[PDB]
Amino acid sequence: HYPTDDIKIKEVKELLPPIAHLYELPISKEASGLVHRTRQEISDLVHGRDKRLLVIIGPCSIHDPKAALEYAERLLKLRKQYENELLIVMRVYFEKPRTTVGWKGLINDPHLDGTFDINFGLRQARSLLLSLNNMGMPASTEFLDMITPQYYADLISWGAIGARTTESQVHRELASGLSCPVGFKNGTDGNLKIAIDAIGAASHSHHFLSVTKAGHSAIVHTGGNPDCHVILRGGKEPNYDAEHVSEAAEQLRAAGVTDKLMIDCSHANSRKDYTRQMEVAQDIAAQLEQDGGNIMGVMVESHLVEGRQDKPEVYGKSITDACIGWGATEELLALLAGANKKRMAR
Amino acid sequence: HYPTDDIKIKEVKELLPPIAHLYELPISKEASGLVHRTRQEISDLVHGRDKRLLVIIGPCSIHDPKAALEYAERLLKLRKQYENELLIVMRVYFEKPRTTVGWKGLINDPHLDGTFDINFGLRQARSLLLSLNNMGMPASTEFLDMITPQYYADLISWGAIGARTTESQVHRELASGLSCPVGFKNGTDGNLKIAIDAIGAASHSHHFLSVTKAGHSAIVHTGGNPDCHVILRGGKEPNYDAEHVSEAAEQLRAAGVTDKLMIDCSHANSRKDYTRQMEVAQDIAAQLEQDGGNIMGVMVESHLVEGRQDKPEVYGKSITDACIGWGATEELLALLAGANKKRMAR
Amino acid sequence: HHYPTDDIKIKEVKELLPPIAHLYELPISKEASGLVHRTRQEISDLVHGRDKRLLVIIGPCSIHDPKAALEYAERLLKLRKQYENELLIVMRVYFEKPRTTVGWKGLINDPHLDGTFDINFGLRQARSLLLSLNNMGMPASTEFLDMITPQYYADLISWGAIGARTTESQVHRELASGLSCPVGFKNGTDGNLKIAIDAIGAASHSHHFLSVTKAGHSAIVHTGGNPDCHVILRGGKEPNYDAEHVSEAAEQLRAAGVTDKLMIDCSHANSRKDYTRQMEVAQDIAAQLEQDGGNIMGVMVESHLVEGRQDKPEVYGKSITDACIGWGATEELLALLAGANKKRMAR
Amino acid sequence: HHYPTDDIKIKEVKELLPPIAHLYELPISKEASGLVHRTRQEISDLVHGRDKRLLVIIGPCSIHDPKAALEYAERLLKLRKQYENELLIVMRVYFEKPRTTVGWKGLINDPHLDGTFDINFGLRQARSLLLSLNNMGMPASTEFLDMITPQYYADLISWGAIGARTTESQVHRELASGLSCPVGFKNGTDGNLKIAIDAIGAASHSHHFLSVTKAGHSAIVHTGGNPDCHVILRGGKEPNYDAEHVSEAAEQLRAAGVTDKLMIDCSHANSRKDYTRQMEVAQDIAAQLEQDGGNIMGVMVESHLVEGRQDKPEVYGKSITDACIGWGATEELLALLAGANKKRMAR
Numbered sequence A, B: 001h002y003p004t005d006d007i008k009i010k011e012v013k014e015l016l017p018p019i020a021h022l023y024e025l026p027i028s029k030e031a032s033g034l035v036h037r038t039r040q041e042i043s044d045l046v047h048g049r050d051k052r053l054l055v056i057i058g059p060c061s062i063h064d065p066k067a068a069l070e071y072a073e074r075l076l077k078l079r080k081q082y083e084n085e086l087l088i089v090m091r092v093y094f095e096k097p098r099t100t101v102g103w104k105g106l107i108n109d110p111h112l113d114g115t116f117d118i119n120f121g122l123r124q125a126r127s128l129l130l131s132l133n134n135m136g137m138p139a140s141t142e143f144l145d146m147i148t149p150q151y152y153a154d155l156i157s158w159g160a161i162g163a164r165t166t167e168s169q170v171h172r173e174l175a176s177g178l179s180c181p182v183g184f185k186n187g188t189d190g191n192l193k194i195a196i197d198a199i200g201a202a203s204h205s206h207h208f209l210s211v212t213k214a215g216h217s218a219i220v221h222t223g224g225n226p227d228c229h230v231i232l233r234g235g236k237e238p239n240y241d242a243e244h245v246s247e248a249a250e251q252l253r254a255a256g257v258t259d260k261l262m263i264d265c266s267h268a269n270s271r272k273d274y275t276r277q278m279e280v281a282q283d284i285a286a287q288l289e290q291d292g293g294n295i296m297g298v299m300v301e302s303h304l305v306e307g308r309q310d311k312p313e314v315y316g317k318s319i320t321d322a323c324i325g326w327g328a329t330e331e332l333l334a335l336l337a338g339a340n341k342k343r344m345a346r
Numbered sequence C, D: 001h002h003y004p005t006d007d008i009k010i011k012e013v014k015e016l017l018p019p020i021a022h023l024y025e026l027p028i029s030k031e032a033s034g035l036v037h038r039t040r041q042e043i044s045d046l047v048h049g050r051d052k053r054l055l056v057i058i059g060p061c062s063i064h065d066p067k068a069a070l071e072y073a074e075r076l077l078k079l080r081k082q083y084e085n086e087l088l089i090v091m092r093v094y095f096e097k098p099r100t101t102v103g104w105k106g107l108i109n110d111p112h113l114d115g116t117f118d119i120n121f122g123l124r125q126a127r128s129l130l131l132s133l134n135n136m137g138m139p140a141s142t143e144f145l146d147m148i149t150p151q152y153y154a155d156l157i158s159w160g161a162i163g164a165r166t167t168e169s170q171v172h173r174e175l176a177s178g179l180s181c182p183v184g185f186k187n188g189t190d191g192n193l194k195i196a197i198d199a200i201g202a203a204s205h206s207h208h209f210l211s212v213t214k215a216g217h218s219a220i221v222h223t224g225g226n227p228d229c230h231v232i233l234r235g236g237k238e239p240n241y242d243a244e245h246v247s248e249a250a251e252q253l254r255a256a257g258v259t260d261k262l263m264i265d266c267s268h269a270n271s272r273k274d275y276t277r278q279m280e281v282a283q284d285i286a287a288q289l290e291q292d293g294g295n296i297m298g299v300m301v302e303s304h305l306v307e308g309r310q311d312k313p314e315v316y317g318k319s320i321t322d323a324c325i326g327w328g329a330t331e332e333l334l335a336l337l338a339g340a341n342k343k344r345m346a347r
């Protein structure tokens, strides 16, 4: 009997089931309310019913929860201060997808040493998310797979599907069952169609494989997600300007889906240069003054300290994509609250 | 206390675990032998040790087990006949991924009526694969998610990551732990880099969430898949000709990965015209007579009967992409067997 | 270094298929469901004296070959039908006899009878046999030795037993309080009746115990209580099958405020482990039913195609556990009891 | 359409958190590991007659409050250290007393003592208490009532009991054969010693039984056998603690080829269910140790902070199960046995 099973597997180990984590860290009355309301409020932006600017803002990836709570602390004050112009939600991404060897995120490797203590990772991520909501900061994250959401999705008010997974059918099937509103990024080369197609798909009922709260293999039957939109993320060339928005809106209308879209100031719209994020936010501001009726949100990569670092030596600086610092963050948010005050007035 | 969990979920049903299917349909000694051996043979083609041509050929999708076994019976005679020039492996794909509402495949919806009997479908899928292996026909399939492989991967001699998932990180991580060699397709608009990257990634050790054979949520630690390669499936224009092969081989060598690749005669290389698959095969034959040192394989969409139909009314005719019938399949294989005979002699 | 404390004396823990995998392959049929439900109700009536038919739990000491069990059942079925107005005949389908010494652990635990413990196959086989029997019109009884096996096949059982060695165990009483069938509790191995009377009282209440869900995962079970429990007199230091022992036991049952209808085991210690004495016990019981026998709702008999026992399974339809009477004796015994009980019912 | 046959008498089946969830929150510590491993070994030495110290299993009849139990442990720890050359002291940590009538089902099953049966909390609390006791330097003993709970906290147990009710049970003996700790089998509730002598023989061999994995999945468990099993004299219709009974037990044990080293329970049927008689029993044991007492390797005592019992848990450190002796009496009893066994050990 020749072996044919698990030939290239080093190990398969049981994780604690989602219920174990839900038992230790149940969502509280206050978190529940924040999440439920924030999702509704985002739905309204998505469907053109309110004209505030959704701002998804925070670290490229979280590596230290201490600093993330500190960042949240400062961000909350601005969330309240711009609450009439801006709906600020924190970026709480645990991993950046990548091609080469490197750190696989807080869930996967919370100790940043390669011991992959995933049970700790998932506990830590739920805990941070619960603390954020408990202090009054709503959270957003990208879902990279079909299982992790069972651990902490109940605490997420806005989810993302990245450029690298927007065309994947099973990620669309996931999105169709996510309790939060979902943004689909255009593709790494600037293809927008894949994202538009994703919205259509994610709005219908689907089936996909996952585990139950008790941790057992299962088939999930979704009811459809009416709250999806596209995110302009750039490509071979940037796609943030009025000519690119207008054309995106036109494609969206022609597909019978929402022509309210979000713009990412980072990644390929900055040319992977964090200093250009402000240029992009400036261009967005300028659009919100002239007209910009098709814009419902913006994405921004921001931390306490500006820049990137290969090891986590320095407190509050990304080890993934380069972020703008806190001062640049005060300026950008102010700029956007100012421009949008004027759009809302009209 | 507002609800936040599963707001958009109709139902989550626990499935029968893999061990339940494996108890009913354990892999036999002969099947095990064939799988182990066919994987090794394909590995030799990927790495240039052997100059026979891998032919992945079969229906676009399986919607009937019976026709599939009869197809396999005919293919098997051609497999044995051409065994010195070709390595013939049957296409056993249970689902074509699609953007529009339609049939979701044999595993998902075995009764083809929207009843979604997944326990039945997974059983029926493993039974078919076991039966093919037992009669001597190795099998190939596309893995769309991270759970289904635990059901029948042990029976698969070659695996595909499709164009819509080649850039997905989790699917690359899956590939890194599959027991079979894996072909990655270029992107839907022709990007070849995502597949070149995918190879590099998938040769390394990774971690992904999945279930154990007993159906429990698990973390999977992989050892890397050294047998991965690219599949040219076309883009905005087809990419099968010698100039496209040579550019691809150069790019592959520059990434330090295998410069032996596979060409898909169907899909965007035929531009969804089944009658142009033969043309592609002819061009491939010409390249093999002249040089074709960078070609290790071909993909072809073939069925008993040519064409396609919306409902499964006609026996042995595709309900997904249009395929060439049996007569054309005989000419195509004779063509390729002869051309590669000359290449091998050289 | 850091010292081990877990599973020190364990060679292996293997996962079993869950009950649901077996239920998937062998779902209960309309006809089996009907027979089980009706038979449980019909036995209930005997426990509470609504009906004076005699329950006869009868069959092999243990099931070691299914073909033989099926053949046995085909013969028994003709007699079940023939005596249906006087007797309610349910087949014994026990898969293990508990023992103190090393030996065969039964068809569930070791179906291949070679020491491989192919428990997944054994459970599958036990379910298949029980389904087949119910499909042919023969209801089935069994003993439950643990708190997990029942999830595999209880749905196919019309009457269940808790043995002499477990009747006093609290968890087995908790089990019984949640079993869907009526349940017979045996007196202790030395003849204690108290432990069985106490178990009826206990099992009539709601309890909790640990078991697994149909999907196979650790669980707490909250029961409703089993109002259909009774005692079984099985001998001990002295036999307890006679009129005087029956009278003393019924007195004790009324004193505890539980059903004074009881079962009598003709085999085991009441027969002094001699299969030929099963007949003399039944004779005594027939005599009781003729005179009065108002406190008797059933009997238990160890019977097979072939009389005797054997150490290896060389002969077809001869037990490899306790020794059984043969088919001829079985025909006799049932005719005896059917005639004796016909008169009692006429009263 | 079908007649229902499944779970007719079941209120609910609730999935439990699996053992791995408890083991993550409360993993065993290096110190606790060392204490459990060593104490297990030490008790093995007493079972096989290599050390003449007396094993004392002492504590509350049941635990219904962990704060009182931790305070009890702290006081006991001081005598454990004081008498360490004469006595090997281990705390009795039983979470439940099996009973026939309606009553409280213990700390694991009903931690809030109100019938809300929050078993997840109960199991969590049980393991937390055991981990705290081992961490402070006090080893723990318990009774295993079923085949699932050991997966939750057995790794923290230095000595185990199978009580009078379950000693004859096949599955409980099978469980014993795989417990990482030494195991004491109590004689039967009417004085039968044979079932416990048998239990030893059986438990020393390899067995199979059904349980769950640490992941909570239905499993078959293959044991390697438990060579450290012994009997416990707990009385019967009449008490069984005196010289004559100990001698008769010992001859019986030698005759079966099993350890003739035994434990005497001062409480239960040996006190006549009267906590003031535990002291009489201990005095008698002590007289045996001064004379000869070569077959005794331990004793069992039900002791709490406060003496006696209560129906509702109104009073701190006082049993709601069996009546216990108080702390003062406990100090007398331990000084007594230490002094008697010091004389034996010197001989």
Ligand SMILES: N[C@@H](Cc1ccccc1)C(=O)O
Residues within 6 Å of the ligand: A146, A147, A149, A150, A153, A154, A177, A178, A179, A180, A210, A211, A220, B004, B005, B006, B007, B009, B012
């Ligand atoms: N629990 C997720 C949905 C989900 C269910 C099952 C599997 C994966 C995701 C939510 O509420 O959004």
Ligand SMILES: N[C@@H](Cc1ccccc1)C(=O)O
Residues within 6 Å of the ligand: A004, A005, A006, A007, A009, A012, B146, B147, B149, B150, B153, B154, B177, B178, B179, B180, B210, B211, B220
């Ligand atoms: N069982 C798969 C690998 C795998 C393991 C676990 C999860 C997913 C996939 C194989 O043998 O190829």
Ligand SMILES: N[C@@H](Cc1ccccc1)C(=O)O
Residues within 6 Å of the ligand: C147, C148, C150, C151, C154, C155, C178, C179, C180, C181, C211, C212, C221, D005, D006, D007, D008, D010, D013
């Ligand atoms: N299913 C059993 C009851 C049961 C449930 C759960 C565990 C054990 C037993 C019956 O119908 O009789």
Ligand SMILES: N[C@@H](Cc1ccccc1)C(=O)O
Residues within 6 Å of the ligand: C005, C006, C007, C008, C009, C010, C013, D147, D148, D150, D151, D154, D155, D178, D179, D180, D181, D211, D212, D221
């Ligand atoms: N884990 C227990 C033994 C055991 C294993 C499995 C089930 C039940 C008990 C011990 O170490 O003692």
Ligand SMILES: [Mn+2]
Residues within 6 Å of the ligand: A060, A061, A096, A301, A320, A321
């Ligand atoms: Mn980033």
Ligand SMILES: [Mn+2]
Residues within 6 Å of the ligand: B060, B061, B096, B267, B301, B320, B321
């Ligand atoms: Mn196709």
Ligand SMILES: [Mn+2]
Residues within 6 Å of the ligand: C061, C062, C097, C268, C302, C321, C322
């Ligand atoms: Mn018998």
Ligand SMILES: [Mn+2]
Residues within 6 Å of the ligand: D061, D062, D097, D302, D321, D322
């Ligand atoms: Mn007690």
